[PDB]
């Protein structure tokens, strides 16, 4: 019935917005990392550790979105 037709739509919108947010956020962060590294490569491993430290908080919320989207799609159905 109508329930599943709307629930697939809901999961779709949630995970689409999650995808956009996560991808473009890491894009912005990584660009500055690469430019600064090109100026002085001695900091690459250090800044790459910083990079994961910050990228975790970038992916914090979008994976709430992805988990609830998968839940709606496979458990609410």
């Amino acid at each position: 019935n109508l329930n599943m037709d709307l629930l697939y739509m809901a999961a779709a919108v949630m995970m689409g917005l999650a995808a956009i947010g996560a991808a473009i956020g890491i894009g912005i962060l990584g660009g500055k990392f690469l430019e600064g590294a090109a100026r002085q490569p001695d900091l690459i491993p250090l800044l790459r550790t910083q990079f994961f430290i910050v990228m975790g908080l970038v992916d914090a919320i979008p994976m709430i979105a992805v988990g609830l989207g998968l839940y709606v799609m496979f458990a609410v159905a």
């Binding site: 100026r39 002085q40 490569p41 001695d42």
Partner: protein
């Protein structure tokens, strides 16, 4: 002529404008790369003007 001592000197010919050799490799980083705050080319031009003048004096 080089003022080698109070009682000794010698005439010399030295390379001035095209930069002579040095013994080093690049120093990657210390403080800030002022270079691109103003135009690099113009500032380097001014600096080398100063360099040649100081050598002559």
């Amino acid at each position: 002529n080089k003022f080698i001592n109070t009682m000794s000197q010698v005439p010399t010919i030295s390379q001035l404008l095209p930069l002579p050799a040095s013994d080093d490799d690049d120093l990657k980083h210390k403080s800030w790369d002022y270079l691109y705050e103003p135009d690099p080319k113009a500032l380097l031009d001014t600096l080398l003007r100063r360099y040649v003048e100081s050598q002559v004096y």
